[PDB]
Amino acid sequence: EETRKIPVPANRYTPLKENWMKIFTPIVEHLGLQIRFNLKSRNVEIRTCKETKDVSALTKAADFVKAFILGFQVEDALALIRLDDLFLESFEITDVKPLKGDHLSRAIGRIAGKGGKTKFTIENVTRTRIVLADVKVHILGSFQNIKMARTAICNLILGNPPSKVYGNIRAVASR
């Protein structure tokens, strides 16, 4: 038998309990794995049983809850279940430019835009999902769509205006 351990932060405990009934149900009716929510160590234990096949799905089961740990939506997390080749890449904002204080706060603003329109446009065009931490940016999607979204995200934080990135990323969508 094999077992995986998944940490959960204290800020992620509230939506984990609120969206709990739609998390273990795909594990039991379609995946055939037993899970438990260890309150004492604040870990999610996933382990095999006598009812499991398709040993490739164990790693996918670990990547299922890890996506919800980082802040992705539930329906975006089950999108990892039914697809087979999806990867997640993360990087900090200051991994590409030293930004301090007010400049760092405006870097997050240019990624989102008014009402998240700039993020949603990149989300809709590259067919990926982007979530924003305090300084980290996590992108989930197919490998070629990651490099297209990472190129648009980096050009946003260089200071190229969101109008130019909105216009350019729709022309690149024709390939």
């Binding site: 329906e75 975006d76 999108a79 039914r82 697809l83 809709n124 067919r127 990926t128 999902r129 989930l140």
Partner: peptide, 25 residues
């Protein structure tokens, strides 16, 4: 959803289009 969006971008829409073309006693 991401998987709904991908599968919609992988398959073809079909279905609704109505084309209007064209004895006892």
């Amino acid at each position: 959803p991401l998987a709904d969006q991908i599968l919609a971008g992988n398959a073809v829409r079909a279905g609704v289009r109505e084309k209007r073309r064209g004895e006892e006693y």
